[PDB]
Amino acid sequence: ADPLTPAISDRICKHMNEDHASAIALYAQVFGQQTDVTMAQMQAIDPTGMDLVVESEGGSKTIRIEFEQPLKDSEDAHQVLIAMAKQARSVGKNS
Amino acid sequence: ADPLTPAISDRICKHMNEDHASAIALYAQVFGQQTDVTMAQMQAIDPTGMDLVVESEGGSKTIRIEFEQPLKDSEDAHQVLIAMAKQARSVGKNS
Numbered sequence: 111a112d113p114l115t116p117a118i119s120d121r122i123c124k125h126m127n128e129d130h131a132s133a134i135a136l137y138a139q140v141f142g143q144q145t146d147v148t149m150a151q152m153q154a155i156d157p158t159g160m161d162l163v164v165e166s167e168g169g170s171k172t173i174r175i176e177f178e179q180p181l182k183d184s185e186d187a188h189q190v191l192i193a194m195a196k197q198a199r200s201v202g203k204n205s
Numbered sequence: 206a207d208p209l210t211p212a213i214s215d216r217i218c219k220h221m222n223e224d225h226a227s228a229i230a231l232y233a234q235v236f237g238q239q240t241d242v243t244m245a246q247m248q249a250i251d252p253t254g255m256d257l258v259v260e261s262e263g264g265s266k267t268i269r270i271e272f273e274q275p276l277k278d279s280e281d282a283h284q285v286l287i288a289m290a291k292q293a294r295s296v297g298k299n300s
């Protein structure tokens with residue numbers, strides 16, 4: 111796969127924001143430890159983490175989630191976004 | 206997104222077979238109604254369905270799963286592959 115350039119990041123974030131916004135809000139809630147998330151957007155994803163813009167009652171906040179293991183290409187990014195969505199759905203059941 | 210040409214199909218199937226083989230076996234079990242699936246591969250995906258090659262004890266069999274609604278582009282393909290994986294994991298619990 112292609113390495114995680116800012117160009118590739120932009121395209122990943124664009125597609126997540128348009129077609130996977132529910133998953134991003136799950137990331138913000140479970141991995142970002144944010145309580146009453148209204149919506150969340152991905153601003154960037156890079157080898158070591160992702161930057162989320164998170165909306166709630168108190169307005170907007172930017173947070174960073176750091177990955178346990180650095181991403182080496184867009185396939186690593188795919189696998190982590192899949193795994194994080196599954197893990198967040200499991201955790202979000204119990205609050 | 207790009208329309209579902211055989212070229213795009215080839216690339217989707219290639220990536221599913223290399224990085225999502227577990228999901229394909231779930232498709233074969235739940236949507237293909239195949240019992241003791243050893244492994245499954247995607248041979249083609251087109252606007253109306255997907256062709257799976259499915260290995261079991263009795264050897265190899267090709268099956269077709271037809272989509273309720275035809276796919277119009279690669280994003281539709283993405284959404285159906287995601288949904289089918291989630292649905293198969295739910296069903297596969299109860300046998």
Ligand code: HEM
Nearest residue numbers: 122125126130133191192195217220221225228286287290
């Ligand atoms: C050849 C291209 C692609 C294929 C074949 C593909 C296939 C899949 C499959 C099978 C899943 C379900 C995984 C599972 O539940 O086991 C999935 C999930 C996902 N993919 Fe892709 N994908 C592709 C490209 C992309 C791209 C370009 C992005 C983002 C920029 C992306 C983002 C995601 C996300 C976020 C999920 C999880 C969605 C959710 O949990 O609701 N995928 N993909």
